Amino acid sequence: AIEVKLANMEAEINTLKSKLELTNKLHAFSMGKKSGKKFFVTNHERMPFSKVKALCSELRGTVAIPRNAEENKAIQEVAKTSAFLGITDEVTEGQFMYVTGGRLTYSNWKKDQPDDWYGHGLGGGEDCVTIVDNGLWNDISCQASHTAVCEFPA
Amino acid sequence: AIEVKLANMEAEINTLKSKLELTNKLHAFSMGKKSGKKFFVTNHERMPFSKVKALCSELRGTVAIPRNAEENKAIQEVAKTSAFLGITDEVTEGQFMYVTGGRLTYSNWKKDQPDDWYGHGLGGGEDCVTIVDNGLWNDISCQASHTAVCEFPA
Amino acid sequence: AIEVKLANMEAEINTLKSKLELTNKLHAFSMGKKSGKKFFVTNHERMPFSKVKALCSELRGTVAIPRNAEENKAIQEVAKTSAFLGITDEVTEGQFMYVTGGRLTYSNWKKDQPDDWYGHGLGGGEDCVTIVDNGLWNDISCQASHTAVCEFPA
Numbered sequence: 001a002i003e004v005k006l007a008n009m010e011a012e013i014n015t016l017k018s019k020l021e022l023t024n025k026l027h028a029f030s031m032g033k034k035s036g037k038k039f040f041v042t043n044h045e046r047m048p049f050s051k052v053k054a055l056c057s058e059l060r061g062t063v064a065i066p067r068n069a070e071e072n073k074a075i076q077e078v079a080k081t082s083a084f085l086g087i088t089d090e091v092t093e094g095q096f097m098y099v100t101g102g103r104l105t106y107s108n109w110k111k112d113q114p115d116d117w118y119g120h121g122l123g124g125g126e127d128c129v130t131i132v133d134n135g136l137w138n139d140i141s142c143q144a145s146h147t148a149v150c151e152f153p154a
Numbered sequence: 155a156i157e158v159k160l161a162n163m164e165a166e167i168n169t170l171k172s173k174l175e176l177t178n179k180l181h182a183f184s185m186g187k188k189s190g191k192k193f194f195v196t197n198h199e200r201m202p203f204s205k206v207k208a209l210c211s212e213l214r215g216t217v218a219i220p221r222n223a224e225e226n227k228a229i230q231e232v233a234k235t236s237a238f239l240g241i242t243d244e245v246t247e248g249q250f251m252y253v254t255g256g257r258l259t260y261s262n263w264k265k266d267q268p269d270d271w272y273g274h275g276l277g278g279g280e281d282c283v284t285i286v287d288n289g290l291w292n293d294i295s296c297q298a299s300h301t302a303v304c305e306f307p308a
Numbered sequence: 309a310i311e312v313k314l315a316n317m318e319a320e321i322n323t324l325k326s327k328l329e330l331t332n333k334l335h336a337f338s339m340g341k342k343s344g345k346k347f348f349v350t351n352h353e354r355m356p357f358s359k360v361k362a363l364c365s366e367l368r369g370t371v372a373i374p375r376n377a378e379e380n381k382a383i384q385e386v387a388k389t390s391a392f393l394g395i396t397d398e399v400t401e402g403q404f405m406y407v408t409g410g411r412l413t414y415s416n417w418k419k420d421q422p423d424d425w426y427g428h429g430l431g432g433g434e435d436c437v438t439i440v441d442n443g444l445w446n447d448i449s450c451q452a453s454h455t456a457v458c459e460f461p462a
């Protein structure tokens with residue numbers, strides 16, 4: 001009976017959907033995702049901010065955004081090098097916004113940062129933000145190439 | 155049409171099964187799984203034994219258990235810090251057993267361990283086991299938080 | 309009812325295909341795949357050449373093959389020790405060919421190599437090639453055990 005075959009096939013599909021969910025949980029776990037916390041991951045490739053945005057979007061994620069000390073340390077450890085954060089004041093100078101919307105709240109600026117430097121020689125000031133090796137932040141040219149770190153929901 | 159469509163769906167489902175199996179194989183390989191050998195994975199999160207057990211269970215794995223010096227070495231390599239092992243004397247004080255059942259066939263106890271110590275203030279003695287930095291074992295409170303290391307079959 | 313169910317099943321299968329593709333993209337990213345570049349992966353296990361071939365084949369990949377300095381560097385960094393490349397002169401002594409077919413177009417041989425040395429006592433000369441610690445190449449016995457590094461398309 002076609003109905004029986006259809007029913008058995010629906011069961012197979014459900015089994016596969018659960019298997020894939022497990023595959024995703026195992027991968028996240030293997031990559032360091034902590035229980036109930038956002039998942040941060042990188043391919044260790046350095047690229048301009050525009051590229052990071054496109055890459056994370058393709059993966060259905062967003063550019064890493066630290067919203068507290070814990071998340072900051074987590075991203076720092078993942079990146080292990082200067083990486084772009086999803087924060088920018090491209091629109092209005094001095095008004096840093098999350099790529100996901102909203103004005104900047106938590107921050108971990110290095111002393112004297114942000115300074116919107118123009119002397120880097122790339123044109124424009126510094127409208128992007130990078131978390132440096134020590135975990136502190138520094139505004140940088142969005143044209144510069146820093147590590148791509150994407151984040152996925154908790 | 156209906157029957158031809160249903161027949162294609164079977165092929166679609168079968169093909170997806172094979173692709174997901176291949177995905178799992180590649181993932182195990184990327185996580186360092188050696189041919190015909192079980193493998194260990196961690197997200198580097200520290201939590202109480204009960205949480206590790208539930209977490210590994212959810213991944214269809216088990217809390218890491220060393221059956222020989224090689225596996226013990228592999229687990230410490232994966233963990234990097236003190237991690238719980240799937241061995242406890244919760245059923246009968248003094249008699250350590252595998253969470254998977256049965257008595258120990260291999261041990262690597264640290265000198266003067268196990269000691270079922272109470273001075274840790276967590277209440278009760280020590281019924282769980284952790285592999286320490288240098289591969290040796292120590293019994294610790296199951297309430298204590300140590301690294302979660304899951305094991306997957308060979 | 310039957311046709312609506314078949315239509316939903318087609319939709320379920322397509323969503324599953326879509327999610328698996330996303331899972332594969334995320335996995336490659338997490339394993340260091342650089343944008344538009346072929347990627348190399350290893351489980352850090354050492355084995356004879358025939359085993360590496362069988363293994364990478366099972367993963368629907370191929371034994372790593374550098375076609376230029378950049379790829380050679382990438383493989384070197386992934387393996388971090390001597391590893392077999394998909395290059396051999398088994399078909400015609402002295403003529404190194406890619407396992408994927410065709411004569412070498414890029415080479416990075418160490419000084420005095422290849423030498424089809426017999427002194428290893430394994431039998432036969434040296435018909436396989438490994439990339440050594442510094443990125444240079446040496447022909448070695450296909451029967452020797454070196455790191456398995458698989459390659460997947462860009």
Ligand SMILES: CC(=O)N[C@@H]1[C@@H](O)[C@@H](O)[C@@H](CO)O[C@H]1O
Binds near residue numbers: 140
């Ligand atoms: C990597 C880094 O910190 N770069 C900063 C640059 O952004 C700008 O602030 C400049 C001002 O002199 O100082 C540099 O140290």
Ligand SMILES: CC(=O)N[C@@H]1[C@@H](O)[C@@H](O)[C@@H](CO)O[C@H]1O
Binds near residue numbers: 267
């Ligand atoms: C982490 C560790 O080793 N803890 C042990 C504890 O389990 C208990 O054995 C105590 C006895 O005095 O000694 C401690 O060093």
Ligand SMILES: CC(=O)N[C@@H]1[C@@H](O)[C@@H](O)[C@@H](CO)O[C@H]1O
Binds near residue numbers: 421423446
């Ligand atoms: C691992 C390695 O480099 N082996 C080489 C071997 O292939 C052969 O060339 C021999 C010549 O005497 O030298 C060895 O060092």
Ligand SMILES: [Ca+2]
Binds near residue numbers: 089090092093126127
């Ligand atoms: Ca500006």
Ligand SMILES: [Ca+2]
Binds near residue numbers: 089094116125126128
């Ligand atoms: Ca600015």
Ligand SMILES: [Ca+2]
Binds near residue numbers: 114115117126139140
């Ligand atoms: Ca700055």
Ligand SMILES: [Ca+2]
């Ligand atoms: Ca089709």
Ligand SMILES: [Ca+2]
Binds near residue numbers: 243244279280281
């Ligand atoms: Ca005890």
Ligand SMILES: [Ca+2]
Binds near residue numbers: 268270280
């Ligand atoms: Ca103890």
Ligand SMILES: [Ca+2]
């Ligand atoms: Ca549904």
Ligand SMILES: [Ca+2]
Binds near residue numbers: 397401402433434436
């Ligand atoms: Ca030869």
Ligand SMILES: [Ca+2]
Binds near residue numbers: 422423424425447
């Ligand atoms: Ca040689």
Ligand SMILES: [Cl-]
Binds near residue numbers: 278280282295296
């Ligand atoms: Cl206990």
Ligand SMILES: [Cl-]
Binds near residue numbers: 433434436
């Ligand atoms: Cl040979």
